[PDB]
Amino acid sequence: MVDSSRRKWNKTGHAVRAIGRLSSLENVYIKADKQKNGIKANYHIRHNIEDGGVQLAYHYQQNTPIGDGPVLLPDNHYLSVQSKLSKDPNEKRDHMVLLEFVTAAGITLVSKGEELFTGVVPILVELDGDVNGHKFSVSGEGEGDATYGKLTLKFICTTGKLPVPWPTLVTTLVQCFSRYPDHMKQHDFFKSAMPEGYIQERTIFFKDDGNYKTRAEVKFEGDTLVNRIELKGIDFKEDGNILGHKLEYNLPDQLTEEQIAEFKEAFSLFDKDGDGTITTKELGTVMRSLGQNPTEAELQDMINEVDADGDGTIDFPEFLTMMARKMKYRDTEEEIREAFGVFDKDGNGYISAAELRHVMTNLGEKLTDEEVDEMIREADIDGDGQVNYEEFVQMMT
Ligand SMILES: [Ca+2]
Ligand SMILES: [Ca+2]
Ligand SMILES: [Ca+2]
Ligand SMILES: [Ca+2]
Ligand code: NA
């Protein structure tokens, strides 16, 4: 009864959420910058806020070769990055342990500098920072293995306490370790600039707060890949998320079997032929039943956003990965309102039973005019017989 309702809901909410993810740009987007003989990159990072929503950090980036040698200017593509932050239980100093996995994708189905990345390469990181006049240094060390896009670093704040959250420095503190697939080796700018290296420059805008400006030199010093950085931060709020340390350090590396099974149920609403992959046709069917009407091109681009193997379809594991990440890094209010907007057909700020029934039956759920009410009940905080925004928020967690 309650069970069925709760279950029928998760499936819908998850499907809507999947469309939200597929309509978003969460990767690192790289483009050639012929005028500078380099590349540009653009992306955003989500920083979960302790007991709250999410902090956005909008990154603009340029990389320029230090040397005169030829480099590879890529076609447009992306890097997909997975990071984990941890603490060294024996470390007394303010520190961060970082693991990253970085892979290039985005282009559907080898430079001299790449030979320097065939095995495990030692890394040294040095940063000097100044944020609102609060100065600091970080040293880090570790190793990278481009064969797997793997890197592991440990950083120490050598000046005492870091005056900003460690997660805000992850992107600043070696994309040369990215795994490029065989068909995309001609688009690896980073390794092509080695050993002489490149300059990596960023402006990072933390929404509703200040911005970082960074300049780094990434180059070999003997056998070690070194990342030397300068960071300047201005316009930060003294009691904002950054200077006020209001950001979460790490997420459970967890995700229960029950959450995974919920993802699988949602997957199966898109994979209508049961073949274990989602096609543009399947994707378009679901979107249209939700009242959208994307073109073929939009459908291919939505799939391409999460298509790890470049086959043109969202395979079962690609979808699982995408959902896991959508649940770990929180949504903006604008994104939750878009999702709400799918159900709220008249746009009055209230999901009626008639609206919900419309959405469900459109998605091809066989539900009773009683199961429909049963669903509203579960979500209805204030007992008005409808679902408002704050109530939707709850229904989506
Ligand atoms: Ca299928
Ligand atoms: Ca695929
Ligand atoms: Ca409405
Ligand atoms: Ca209500
Ligand atoms: Na603001």
Numbering used by the authors: 47 to 155, 170 to 233, 237 to 460
Quote the study on this structure.
Four calcium ions are tightly bound in CaM domains at the corresponding binding sites, confirming the holo-form of the indicator.
In contrast, the GCaMP6s-BrUS-145 variant exhibited a pronounced calcium-dependent change in its mean lifetime over a wide range. In contrast, the GCaMP6s-BrUS-145 variant was found to be extremely dim, showing only 10.5% of GCaMP6s’ brightness. Compared to GCaMP6s-BrUS, the resolution of GCaMP6s-BrUS-145 is higher, allowing the visualization of extra two solvent molecules in the vicinity of the chromophore.
